[PDB]
Structures are given as structure tokens and as C-alpha cells.
Amino acid sequence: VPEVDNPHCPNPWLNEDLVKSLRENLLQHEKSKTARKS
């Protein structure tokens, strides 16, 4: 059976702690080079 630990938000308890940077950076890593200067 397929159900180890990835439903849709398995361990986002911590992924989210820094994947979202490393994700919401697809173009929010521009947030920096885009939303953090001017």
C-alpha cells in the first residue's frame, strides 16, 4: 500500500519552515532581488 508519509502535506511541519522559501522563491526569491530593495 502507498501511504508512507506523503499525503499532500506530510511533513510540512518543517518543510514548510524552509521549503516555501525554497519554493515561494520560484519568483519570490525575487522578493529579495525584487521586493526587498526599493
Side-chain angles (χ1 to χ4, degrees):
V1 75
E3 15 152 88
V4 177
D5 73 321
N6 123 239
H8 222 278
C9 199
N11 93 296
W13 291 302
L14 43 127
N15 128 86
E16 107 196 316
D17 217 68
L18 190 265
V19 183
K20 329 303 294 237
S21 323
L22 168 134
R23 259 178 43 87
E24 155 142 296
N25 69 217
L26 282 4
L27 49 136
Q28 352 277 197
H29 91 138
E30 324 281 51
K31 284 186 111 229
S32 271
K33 309 99 35 155
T34 211
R36 88 85 149 134
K37 175 182 188 189
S38 174

